[model samples]
Target: KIRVDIWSDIACPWCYIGKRRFESALGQFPQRDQVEVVWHSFELDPSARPLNPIAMRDGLAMKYSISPAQAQGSLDHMTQTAAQEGLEYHFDRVKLANTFLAHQLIHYAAEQGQGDAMKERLLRAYMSEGQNVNDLDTLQKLAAEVGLDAGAARAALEAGTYAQAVRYDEAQAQQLGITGVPFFVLGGKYGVSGAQAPETLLGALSQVWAEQHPAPLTMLGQDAPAEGC
Candidate 1:
């Protein structure tokens, strides 16, 4: 089976778009059933504290040293991009979150074998539903919504459970020299960066699969980059 490890953050807009694109590619890939996906933690702002509920555009403006209008423009572009993927992005209602606790919740869900569901739920909550993912109550509620035990999730959050797991994932990202979200490591060898087009992602997947499970081929061989947010 092929292993596809993805590094992403809840607060990243491109990560969600990249996810949809990758899923689209996987859906069309002939070897889809042979692939295994693992989600890893990557916080865009590790030291970000609990939110004061800043507007998404305002936060982006401050963080990137850009005008509010420019930030809004970026958001507008991303919203259109996300819409192309059939995702509804409510940037107007988005509340910037710290995402550390959210990462911990994802790790907990992974322990229960529901990591992907929890990840999707949290992303939808943050990107479309205007939920503050940094809040423990919100995380617990989202966990239950994804079929995890809400009470257990709340307890785990309060106890800092999975904190180490989140940290370890970040440490691994650092060791791997990853500086971006939505990074894909295919077959544990090929690293494909950013929210590349679905066709590009599919090509990376096919390349890795072909390399690992070699077939008698024509006398030729081949080889690929993207944004961090």
Candidate 2:
């Protein structure tokens, strides 16, 4: 079986979009059933805290030292890009908050075999629903929506049960020199960065799968005469 490790943050818009692209690529893969996807944690703002709701474009401008107009342009591009992936991004209502706890929640959900579902729900909640992911009550609700035991999830969060697991993923990302969100590591060998096109991601998957499962060589001259060395 092949494994694909994705390093991403819940608050990252590009990561959500890249996720859709990767999903599409995986759907088209002939050996999709043989592939295992593992989600890893990466916080865009490690020191981030719950803050008053602000226009995402304005937040983007302040964070990047760009003009409001430039930020709007970037957001507009991102919105259109996401639309192509069938995702709705409501940046206007986004509340910039710390994702450390959210990452911990993902680690917890992974133990329950619902890692992908948890990741999807959190991304949608943050990017489209404008929900606060760091809040324990809200996270518990989201967890229940994805079929997890809400009370258990809440207890896990309160206990910081998966904090170390989240940190381990971050440390691995650091060692790999991954500086951005939505990075993909296929078969532990091929590393893909950024929100690449579906075709591009599919090509990477196909290449890796081919390398690992090459076809047997056809005999060239009727199985050649036996030769003694």
Candidate 3:
């Protein structure tokens, strides 16, 4: 079985875009059932806070020490890329907040085998729908959409139930020197960085599958020259 370990933050636009690209590639692979996709928790923001987060563009400005206009421009450009991936990013209405709980909630979803779906919902909520990721109400709504019980999700978040798992992924990321979001580890060895094209991801899957399960040798109607020749 091949594992695709992906570390991504809901706040990362490229991570969302990359997810779609990866999904597209997986769809085209014949051995899709043999691959397991695990969404590890990751955040590029501060600790948990109230629902009222700073403007996402402003947060980006502060983080990169740039002007709000410049940061907005970056987001603007990303919208174009996202459009190509069939994602419409509404950065203007997006807000920034500590995504620890969001990460923790996704961990719970992973346990329920809805990790991929939960991640998609979270990314869409934060990036496209302008939902408050830190708000329990918003989270509950998103969690419920992915088949996770809202009450249990609330209880877990309030108790920090899956906090440990979230940290474990972060530790693994640190150990691997992963300082960026949308990073992918295929077959537990090959590392893919950034929101690469679907063709590139498709190539990775083919390469990994061939390595892990090589085809038995069969003559392709040709052979090496005989020593007599």
Which candidate gets the maximum TM-score versus the true structure?
Answer: 2
lDDT of 3: 0.88
**Model 1 over residues 45-73: C-alpha lDDT tens digits?**
99887885678888899989999989999
In candidate 1, list every pair of residues with a backbone clash: none
Against the reference, the lDDT scores of all candidates come to 0.92, 0.92, 0.88
TM-score of each: 0.92, 0.93, 0.90
Model 1, which residues run further than 4 Å from truth?
Answer: 216-229
Evaluation by lDDT, superior candidate among 2 and 3: 2
Separately for all candidates shown, the number of backbone clashes (residues 3 or more apart, or on different chains) is 0, 0, 0
- Judge candidate 2 at residue 147 and give its lDDT: 96
lDDT of 2 by residue, 1-229 (tens): 8899999999899999999999999999999999999999998888876654678898899999999999999998999999999998888878788899999999989999999999999999999998999889999999999999999999999999899989999999999999998999999988999998999999999999899988897866665667897
In candidate 3, the residue pairs with backbone N, CA or C atoms under 3 Å apart (3 or more residues apart, or in different chains) clash, namely none
Of 1 and 2, the candidate ahead on TM-score is 2
